[PDB]
Amino acid sequence: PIAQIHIREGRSDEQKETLIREVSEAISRSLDAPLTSVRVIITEMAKGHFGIGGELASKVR
Amino acid sequence: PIAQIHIREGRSDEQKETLIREVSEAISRSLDAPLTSVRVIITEMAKGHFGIGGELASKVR
Amino acid sequence: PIAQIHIREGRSDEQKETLIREVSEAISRSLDAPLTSVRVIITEMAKGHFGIGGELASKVRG
Amino acid sequence: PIAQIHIREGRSDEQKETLIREVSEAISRSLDAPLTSVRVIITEMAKGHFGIGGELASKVRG
Amino acid sequence: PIAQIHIREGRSDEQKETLIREVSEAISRSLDAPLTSVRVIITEMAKGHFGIGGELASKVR
Amino acid sequence: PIAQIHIREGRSDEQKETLIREVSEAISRSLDAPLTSVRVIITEMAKGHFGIGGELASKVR
Numbered sequence A, B, E, F: 001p002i003a004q005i006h007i008r009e010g011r012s013d014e015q016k017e018t019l020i021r022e023v024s025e026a027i028s029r030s031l032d033a034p035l036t037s038v039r040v041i042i043t044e045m046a047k048g049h050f051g052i053g054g055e056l057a058s059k060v061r
Numbered sequence C, D: 001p002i003a004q005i006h007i008r009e010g011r012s013d014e015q016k017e018t019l020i021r022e023v024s025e026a027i028s029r030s031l032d033a034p035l036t037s038v039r040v041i042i043t044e045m046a047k048g049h050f051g052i053g054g055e056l057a058s059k060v061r062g
């Protein structure tokens, strides 16, 4: 499995590390797949690069 | 957060549903994010559409 | 014998493969026919492509 | 599930009725589906209506 | 189907959520029923509001 | 736990017997409760005794 996760930029290396591990375990667990086959890509979203409903996420929320 | 997960085709609706849930909870847990903000897209990979080391995954396993 | 089986989508490769095997054995057994002559085609039915009583199956379930 | 089974003509009512029952049970069993959702259609193939390898089946048998 | 489940209070949101899901699936499965049509009400029982044998349950387990 | 399940009418004994068992196990499983403590009441709804949206269910949708 290959997960690409889009997240708003603003987080700790530690927190992102936790995301990677937690997600990888959830994938491996629920697909009954080896952990080794699980790859996670995290793609950070700059403050003005993500929109919800045509507004900026930063603005509305 | 928006996770797109690429997986090999061949799984029950039940198992995919559990992937979605488990992954969503891992994301919302580790980012301290509302669940409501978590979106998961599952993109299935046909047997002949995913290669590992230049050779088909079904093959290479 | 050639069986075409229409089933609702949503099942594991494993389960469909069991269906194929089980059905094949039931045909061969009951017709006293060689297994080799038994062919099975599964045709999956998308969640809006199968109706019971004019309503979607998804909605009545049976 | 809806199975349509194509078989060569020439069989007893009994034997076909066993086919229907056996197949139905194999489907219900392997899909973990209610028996009562299982429908089987048997379509018989006349002696000159089924070909294997471009030659009539009656002639080549399998 | 409409299930109202009476349970003793004292359990995680997480855990009640899983009750709802599991029970819904058991109903839909065993009645061959659309899930959509399954509705579950959890009503909670305060420690002094549930009696077994004229005794408080709290007490008698 | 005590579930009361409202269901339409018109089913097997066998099917209702499965419902009871399936549900009971889902409750016991998800609450980590003893089976023995699980009670299920099933209440059947006559053809003209259940309404969805003010019409009869027999008739919706």
Ligand SMILES: [Cl-]
Residues within 6 Å of the ligand: E008, E057, F001, F037
């Ligand atoms: Cl109790």
